[PDB]
Amino acid sequence: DAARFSCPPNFTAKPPASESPRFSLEALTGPDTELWLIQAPADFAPECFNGRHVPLSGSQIVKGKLAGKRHRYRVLSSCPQAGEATLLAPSTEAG
Amino acid sequence: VKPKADVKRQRIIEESTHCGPQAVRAALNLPEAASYDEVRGKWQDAHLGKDQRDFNM
Amino acid sequence: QIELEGRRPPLMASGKSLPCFEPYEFTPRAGGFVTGRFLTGIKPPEFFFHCMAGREGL
Amino acid sequence: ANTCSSFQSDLDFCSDCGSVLPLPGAQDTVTCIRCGFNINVRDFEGKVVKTSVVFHQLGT
Amino acid sequence: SRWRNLPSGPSLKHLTDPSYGIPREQQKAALQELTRAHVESFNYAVHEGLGLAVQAIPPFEFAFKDERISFTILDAVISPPTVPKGTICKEANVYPAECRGRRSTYRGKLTADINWAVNGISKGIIKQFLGYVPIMVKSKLCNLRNLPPQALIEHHEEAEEMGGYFIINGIEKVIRMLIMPRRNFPIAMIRPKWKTRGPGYTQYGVSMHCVREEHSAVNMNLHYLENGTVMLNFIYRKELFFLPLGFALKALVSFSDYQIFQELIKGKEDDSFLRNSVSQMLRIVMEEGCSTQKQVLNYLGECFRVKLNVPDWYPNEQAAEFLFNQCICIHLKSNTEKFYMLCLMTRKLFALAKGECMEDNPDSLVNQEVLTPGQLFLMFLKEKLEGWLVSIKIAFDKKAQKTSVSMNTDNLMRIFTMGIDLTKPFEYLFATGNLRSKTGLGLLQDSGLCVVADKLNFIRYLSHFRCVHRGADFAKMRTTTVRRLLPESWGFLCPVHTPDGEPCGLMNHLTAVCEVVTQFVYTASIPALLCNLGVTPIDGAPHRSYSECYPVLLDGVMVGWVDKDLAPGIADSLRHFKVLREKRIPPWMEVVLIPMTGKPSLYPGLFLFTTPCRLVRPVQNLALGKEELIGTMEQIFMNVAIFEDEVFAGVTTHQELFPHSLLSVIANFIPFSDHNQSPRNMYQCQMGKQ
Amino acid sequence: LPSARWQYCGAPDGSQRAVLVQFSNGKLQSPGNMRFTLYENKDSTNPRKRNQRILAAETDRLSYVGNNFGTGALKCNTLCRHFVGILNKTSGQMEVYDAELFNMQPLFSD
Amino acid sequence: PMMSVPVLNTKKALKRVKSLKKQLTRVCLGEVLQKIDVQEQVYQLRFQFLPHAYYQQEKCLRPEDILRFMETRFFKLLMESIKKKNNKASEAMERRVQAVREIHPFIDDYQYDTEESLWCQVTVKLPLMKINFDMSSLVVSLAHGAVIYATKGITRCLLNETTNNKNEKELVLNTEGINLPELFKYAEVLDLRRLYSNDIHAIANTYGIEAALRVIEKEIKDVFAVYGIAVDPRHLSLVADYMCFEGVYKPLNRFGI
RNA sequence: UGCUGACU
DNA sequence: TCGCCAGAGGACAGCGAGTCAGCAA
DNA sequence: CTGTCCTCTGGCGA
């Protein structure tokens, strides 16, 4: 017998989102869709890059504006390394 | 020391400031010339070596 | 020419003999060759190398 | 799952050394698989080419 | 700055000035910065460090009759000196002018408020009077603080004095900065007398000297055994105990054996003797009986319970935590951080063993730090407070073991029964100089800790607050290699100022511009800034191969793995912050980046020290002209011109403030020292003090 | 060099988060047979507890558990932030979302 | 330790000495090797020896002798060390291979190199349970202290061409080891009278004690000479006569009393 | 008696 | 088949003279 | 620190 994870009494299972068709497995497996993992400093404001052209290879300095102050962010793009975080998505197939 | 004798001393001291590369190189038995950075690397290797008798050379 | 253990002054762990000298510097000055005399004193690095040798003696 | 030849893969700790044919189920969670691995672990390694050698060092 | 307004040529029109005898409005400020390391250390030791010391102080629970009693020390406070009790009249204060006339100690009152409980529902806060602790002269717990030179003359004082000393029986003991290995940094060492520690030990090992908040120090050694296995030696109460690694790693972290392994093979994931030796550490001694964190803690608890002297009603799992808290990596609060630090020290022994790294000389100032008067004072205070608790409750358990219900009537009569202790023990360390402690305080020396400061001259006196003693044990050694004046003490120790007989090379003196760090800062926003700069947290996704990455450390805590092409820019950015006082980088953080090549150079990685006992020295930062402060280890990877016209474009990152910065304070009083031979400047320094 | 136009469609209230998993013992050879269940704390009034989550993964042989709180919560979840970018190759537009990273670990009880 | 025998001053002796110097220097397996290639319980090993261009010049070695050495000494010291570890752990190619595996039960087959030691490997296997680690460590710590052949006690010779101005024609075969009898075979190449060594215990065993007295005296004199000091011979005579009083070279220390 | 300094 | 050539570590014992002072146990 | 002195210490043919 596998001791089956037992959920603590103060926790409840979160249902899937049927109102989420975006992170749906179907949407993510589309031939024109690519998934990217992004790591940033804790104080990084992603909105500062809105409309700006982030690189898909190499290293580039990208300028962002936050609260009126100009910030410049070095962006490094790479080939996924074996062992990287896997994205979980709701699947109708998985009940 | 007499002047006209410290001028020769000064010129010899000026000449002595150019005798390191040749000395070290011709002691590592490196190509006689054409290497100016291989010599620094060979000296570094001889310095971090374990035996340390190519450094005393 | 300063000589401590029968050898020139020792290098640091980074390859420089003294904070003033580039690492692995070829000039004899960087190895303890003092061209100054007590008539006209010896610059600050030569004073340090000379001090290592006088202390080795004591 | 992608852990090699000394761990449990599913679990976490490291298995014991081989004696009987079956993968030696660990003291915890004794599940077994791959009694004897397909290929013996082959290792490609050699020595250095400056001191031990009189070759590779004619000049340089 | 602090070296501006330095005279350009001497003058003689200051004597023969109409104001020669008028006492000045404020004290000199250049003479004050000499004993500054002795006073700013004590100021912390007695106010901000004492609270932290008492905060550790595990509550001393023990059994009375069939009852269990808990005693905790909530606060301890040292008061300025004062007339004993009120039995005296007309002036409560007590100024150091007396106790020199009389022959007595300038001692302040140390009192704490203990809190005793019976199971935690019955409690009362009593305020016991612990004893008397000596006080430094201008130390914030002294009566001569904040006095101008004119008011310092009506009390019979020097009008130019900087105390930095103690008056133990009117003798002015001058406890001097001893040399310690380092703090919170793993030093890889090749000592051949280590293979005698056991059957298969080798002459390789990384030592770490751990200090927590300046109140606790501990020394832990990771040894390499010939099998490829690593052992851990810890010392508790002067006894050496050897625990295989794996027992320690499994206890500290509830992680799988493969995850512990994936960590100790981070940079050498192709090597196969290592991969095989890591597995032998995890399986050979741990799959032999204990495979869950608790069983490891339980086994470790049973073997060590007898010599850790733990409470009898303690589960073995609780006795294990006691060992890890009090003996291994004192500096780190977390057990997860303590795991990552033991893993980097091992990853380093594997590189020293395979000859991929150079042994760190313990005798280079790169791998050395100083022990100030406040670290010795607090580290003795804390130990004596723990001893006081133990003795009061020895008396407790021994008196009657009798129905504490009504015995709450004599509880104070009980605590006072052993509160008669803390005074004389403290004066021994100061009047005699030698240390009587159950744990030697992570020190290695037990004598010559405090010395008489004699005012034969003001050049004998000023040299007691700038002396640095390599150690008192090295005065007895056949080999003379701790007497070599290496080129790494450039600007930090004077070449000329050394005693010229039996103490030669062992008693050094700081240059005029050198200084000890003594401030304590937050250093909490630094780990979050390093990540903005380009570091990737120890948790994962390095973005490269763990071999083309630098292991980032910040005061014992491994932030982790700045990429190899981002390490230079990160070091330069951090150096620009400290110089311009941006972010919260302390003006004195040492950003070190030991580069990595294929050669057996010192182990690579970006360190960042900000601890309170390192030596620093000013240098004019070129390219900014902003008077940076560099440390003993940070100075080995940078070019520092002395004279201008010696500055170059790519070379000469920095420049020195004055050309005579290298020489001590006394060696700067010798005229034309450049034209005399050096053994003569060493005798002049010793003759100007007689 | 190939580039993408950055857009943070992100989370409407920031209540929405994606879910990233990392296994402490390596890569799962067959992630297709795993069932993941995300658990959240019932206490929505306590700001400290309202963000506590447990991720459980069940296989035939073992269970994995990851949490964003307590010892199992690791430093990377805060010092750094994680995002997921969804790139439309045709439009060159990258949509960026907040992500939560769970470090997964095996399940056993005495 | 050292020696110094003059060279006999004859045309034949001068020619034979070159070979003599090249004959007494130690050649060790490690001084002749390029790099090993270890594969691993079936542990193979290819030695890949150096070409003769740059080591036969001053070592007097030949490849058949060197390889024969591996078959008879290294490949069995290897099993000796494997047992050292495993005791406390818990047409013509054919005859050579056959005799070699006649003597050991682990090896299978090596190789042959009919062209200047092209590829010379070996294969072993311990099939049941052995500690499979990077045994390259053992076969490298052993391929250093493994010496092809050396005169016992002599580590290197050298001919310091000139030692005299009066009769400049002198040649000396100095050595950095000490084996007196292993030079007695060259009484026609070298002058065995005039043989000198700084050992004083070896002289006292090959020539007697009255010959060690003078070596003691000359050693003390040459020690003082490097500093210009000069103690009178009448003092060293008494010291050497007292030290060698009772037939043996006795130390002047706590065990001599 | 010991620890700290100190002299040639 | 264990005696003696070899072979290992462990233990001990030495570490220049002679002076002057103070402080403290 | 380094040296001898000392005490074992199990290992192949006679």
Q: Which residue is nearest to nucleotide H5 (CA to C1')?
A: E452
Q: Who touches strand J, with Cβ under 7 Å?
A: E 477-479; G 251, 255
CA–CA dist G81, G131 (Å, integer): 14
| Probe site for chain C from E485, E622, E640, E677 (most C CB atoms < 10 A) | E485
Q: Tell me the C-alpha distance between A91 and A29, whole Å.
A: 12
Distance CA E559, CA F78 (A): 13
E135: left (phi over 0), alpha (psi -120 to 50) or beta: beta
Cα–Cα separations (whole angstroms), residue C10 to C45, E259, E463, E484, G224: 14, 44, 29, 10, 30
In a 13 Å sphere around the CA of A94, the CA atoms on its Cβ side amount to 17
Q: Which of A72, A75, A47 is nearest to F96 (CA)?
A: A47
- Pair E516, E615: CB distance under 8 Å: yes
d(CA C7, CA C30): 13
Q: Are E140 and E47 in contact (CB under 8 A)?
A: yes
| Helix extents (H) in E14-64 | 36-43, 49-56
| Distance from C-alpha of G107 to C-alpha of G100, rounded to nearest angstrom | 9
- The alpha-carbon gap from F35 to the nearest alpha carbon of chain E, in Å, equals 21
| C-alpha dist (Å) from residue F58 to F32, F41, G184 | 11, 20, 84
d(CA E659, C1' I10) / Å: 56
Which protein residue lies nearest to nucleotide I24, measured between its Cα and the C1' atom? E432
Collect all residues of chain B within an 8 Å Cβ-Cβ radius of residue D50.
45
Distance of CA B2 to the CA centre of its chain: 31
Phi/psi-derived region of residue E280, left when phi > 0, alpha when psi is between -120 and 50, beta in every other case: alpha
CATH code for the domain of E233:
3.90.1110.10
Distance CA E166, CA D41 (A): 69
In whole angstroms, how far apart are CA C26 and each of A88, A95, C6, C17, D60?
Answer: 61, 74, 19, 11, 19
3-state secondary structure (DSSP) of residue E222: strand
Asked if chain G contacts chain A via 3 or more Cβ pairs within 8 Å, the reply is no
On whether the CB atoms of residues E573 and E579 are closer than 8 A, the answer is: no
Asked if strand I comes closer than 7 Å to E196 Cβ, the answer is yes
Assess contact for F52 and F61: CB atoms under 8 A: no
The three state secondary structure string of E392-456 is HHHHHHHHCCCCHHHHCCCHHHHHHHHCCCCHHHHHHHHHCCCCCCCCCCCCCCCCCCCCECCCC
In angstroms, the separation between the Cα of residue D59 and the nearest Cα of chain B is 7
The nucleotide whose C1' lies nearest the CA of E170 is: I23
Nearest Cα to E562, choosing from E597, E610, E604?
A: E604
CB E328 within 8 A of CB E234: yes
Place of tokens 């990552």: E340
C1' of I14 to CA of G243 (Å): 20
Q: List the structure tokens of E495.
A: 């070449």
Nearest residue (Cα to C1') for H8?
Answer: E501
In contact, E464 and E453? CB cutoff 8 Å: yes
Residue E339 · residue E253 · CB < 8 Å:
yes
> Does residue D4 have a known ligand-binding role?
no
Phi, psi dihedral angles at G80 (to 5 degrees): -60, -45
Q: Say whether residue D60 is in contact with chain B using an 8 A CB cutoff.
A: yes
Task: Tell me the two tokens of residue E658.
Answer: 């004055």
Burial class (CB in 10 A: 0-12, 13-18, 19+), E385: buried
Report the distance separating Cα C29 and Cα B13, nearest Å: 10
CA dihedral E155, E158, E162, E168 (to 10 degrees): -70
Dist. CA E654–CA E647, nearest whole Å: 9
Q: Which residues are bridge partners to G38 per DSSP? A: D45, G45
DSSP assignment of E134-161: E-BTTSSSSTTTT--TTHHHHTT--SS-
Q: By the CB < 8 Å criterion, does F24 face chain E?
A: yes
User: Measured in whole angstroms, how far is the alpha carbon of residue E341 from the centre of its chain?
Assistant: 18
Q: What is the distance between the alpha carbons of residues G229 and C6, in angstroms, rounded to a whole number? A: 21
Give Cα separations from E510 to E617, E641, E663, G4, G229 (angstroms): 10, 20, 8, 54, 42
Q: Write a three-state SS string for E237-275.
A: CCEEEEEECCHHHHHHCCCCHHHHHHHHCCCCCCCHHHH
List Cα–Cα distances, E297 to C9, D15, E247, E289, E442, in angstroms.
52, 21, 8, 12, 26
Full residue range of the structural domain in which residue E337 is found = 180-371
Q: Can you tell me the distance from the alpha carbon of E155 to that of E146, in angstroms, rounded to the nearest whole number?
A: 13
Strand I reaches within 7 A of the E435 CB: no
CB contact under 8 A, E258 and D28: no
Query: What token pair was written down for E70?
Result: 């808990």
Strands (E), E534-664: 549-550, 553-554, 562-563, 590-594, 605-609, 615-621, 628-631, 640-641, 654-656
- Asked if the C-beta of E601 comes within 8 angstroms of chain B's C-beta atoms, the answer is yes
Task: Report which of G145, G170, G122, G173 is spatially closest to residue G18, judged by C-alpha positions.
Answer: G173
How many angstroms separate the CA atoms of C47 and E22, rounded?
41
Q: What proportions of chain G, in percent to the nearest 5, are helix, strand and coil?
A: 40, 10, 50
**Residue E523: Cβ within 10 Å count:** 17
D vs G, Cβ pairs < 8 A, gives 51
Closest CA to F103 of F69, F67, F70: F67
- Please name which of G6, G21, G19 lies closest in space to residue G163, comparing C-alpha atoms: G6
Best interface-test mutation with E: which of B48, B50, B51, B55 has the largest number of E CBs within 10 A?
B48
Alpha-carbon span E299 to C5, nearest angstrom: 54
Regarding chains G and F, contact by 3 or more CB pairs under 8 A is answered as no
Question: How many Å apart are CA E264 and CA E345, to the nearest integer?
Answer: 10
* Gap between the Cα atoms of F87 and F3, Å rounded: 10
Residues of chain E with Cβ-Cβ distance to B44 below 8 Å are: 599
Q: How far apart are CA B3 and CA B7, in angstroms?
A: 7
Q: Detail the protein residues whose CB sits closer than 7 A to any atom belonging to strand H.
A: E 433-434, 447-448, 451-452, 454, 469, 472, 475, 499-501, 503, 507, 686-687, 690
Give the separation between CA C53 and CA G183, rounded to whole angstroms: 45
Element (H, E) at F81: strand F80-88
Q: How close are the terminal C-alpha atoms of chain D, in Å?
A: 47
- Judged by DSSP in three states, E173 sits in strand
E601 contacts on B by Cβ (under 8 Å): 48
Report phi then psi at E40, rounded to 5: -70, -20
Could you give the CA distance from residue C3 to residue F5 in angstroms, rounded to a whole number? Answer: 66
Experimental determination technique: cryo-EM
What CA–CA distance (Å, rounded) separates E606 from E596? 10
What count of other Cβ atoms lies within 10 Å of the Cβ of residue E532? Answer: 18
C-beta separation of A23 from F63 below 8 A:
no
Q: Which residues contact E166 (CB under 8 A, 6 or more apart)?
A: E105, E106, E134, E135, E136, E137, E172, E173, E174, E175, E430, E450
CA trace torsion B34, B40, B41, B46 (10° rounding): 120
CA-CA distance, D8 to E256, in Å (whole number)? 9
CA distance E221 to E189: 10
Breaks (C–N over 2.5 Å) after residues, chain B: none
Using CA atoms, how far residue E245 sits from E167, E346, E553, E554, G208, in Å, is: 48, 9, 21, 24, 60
**Residue E529 contacts residue E583 (beta carbons within 8 Å):** yes
| Tokens of residue E134, six digits | 């000596």
CA distance E373 to E175: 6
Closest CA to E295 of D27, D17, F61, F72: D27
Question: Are residues F15 and A17 in contact, defined by beta-carbon separation less than 8 angstroms?
Answer: no
For residues C17 and C29, is the Cβ–Cβ distance under 8 A?
no
CA dist., res. E242 & res. E249, Å (int): 14
Cα–Cα nearest to E36, from E514, E506, E600? E514
Instruction: Output helix, strand, coil percentages for chain D, rounded to the nearest 5.
Output: 0, 5, 95
Rounded to a whole number of angstroms, the distance from the CA of C16 to the nearest CA of chain E is 8
Distant-in-sequence, close-in-space partners of E448: CB < 8 Å, separation ≥ 6 = E433, E434, E469, E472
Q: Cite the beta strand spans of A1-95 per DSSP E.
A: 11-13, 33-41, 53-55, 58-66, 69-77, 86-88
A83: which DSSP letter?
T
Phi, psi of F7 (to 5 degrees): -135, 125
Taking an 8 Å cut-off on Cβ atoms, the answer to whether D29 and F108 are in contact is yes
Q: How far is CA E283 from the centre of its chain?
A: 37
CB count, 10 Å around CB of E400? 12
Nucleotide nearest to E467 (CA to C1'): H5
d(CA G163, CA G171): 7
The residue type of F2 is: P
DSSP G181: G
Q: Does C24 touch chain B (CB under 8 A)?
A: yes
The amino acid occupying position F107 is: L
DSSP codes joined into one string, F41-56? ES--S-TTTTT-EEEE
Q: Is nucleic acid strand I under 7 Å from E431's C-beta?
A: yes
Contacts of F4 (CB under 8 A, 6+ apart): A53, A54, A55, A56, F85, F87, F92, F93, F94
Radius of gyration for the alpha carbons in chain C, expressed in angstroms and rounded: 11
**F104 CA: distance to closest CA in chain D (Å):** 11
CA distances from E681 to E410, E499, E505 (A): 67, 11, 15
Q: In what order do the strands lie in the sheet with E553-554?
A: E553-554, E605-609, E590-594
The 3-state secondary structure of E633-667, one letter per residue:
CHHHHCCEECCCCCCCCCCCCEEECCCCCCCECCC
Secondary structure (3-state) at G83: helix
Interatomic CA–C1' length for residue G126 and nucleotide I4, angstroms: 35
User: Within a 10 A sphere around the Cβ of E300, how many other Cβ atoms?
Assistant: 23
| CA angle (E60 as vertex; E58, E66 as ends), nearest 5 | 145
Dihedral, CA of residue C43, residue C48, residue C54 and residue C56, to nearest 10: -150
Who contacts E155 (Cβ-Cβ below 8 Å, separation ≥6)? E95, E97, E144, E147
E97-113 CB burial, b ≥16 within 10 A, e <16: eebeeeeebbbbbbbbe
CA pair distance F109, F107, nearest whole angstrom: 7
Q: Give dist(CA G200, CA E624) in Å, integer.
A: 69
Two tokens, residue E541: 């996704």
CA angle B13, B16, B22 (to 5 degrees): 175
Residue with tokens 């010379």: G120
J13 C1' to G64 CA distance, Å? 33
Write down which chains contact chain G via at least 3 CB pairs under 8 A.
D, E
The two three-digit tokens of residue D52, written as one number: 């031990």
Alpha-carbon distances of E8 from E16, E27, E625, E658, E666, rounded to whole Å: 20, 22, 20, 11, 18
E298-304 LR contacts (CB < 8 Å, sep 24+): E299/E247, E300/E243, E300/E247, E300/E251, E304/E241
Closest CA relative to residue G58, chosen from G19, G5, G12 = G19
On whether the CB atoms of residues E392 and E128 are closer than 8 A, the answer is: no
E256 with D43: Cβ contact below 8 A? no
| Annotated binding residue E4 | no
CA dist., res. E58 & res. G188, Å (int): 87
C-to-N gaps above 2.5 Å in chain A, after residues: none
Q: What is the DSSP string of G43-75?
A: -EEE--PPPGGGTGGGT---HHHHHHHIIIIIH
Encoding tokens for residue G181? 């009898």
Q: Mention every residue, 6+ apart, whose C-beta is less than 8 A from residue E187.
A: E181, E206, E207, E208, E360, E362, E367
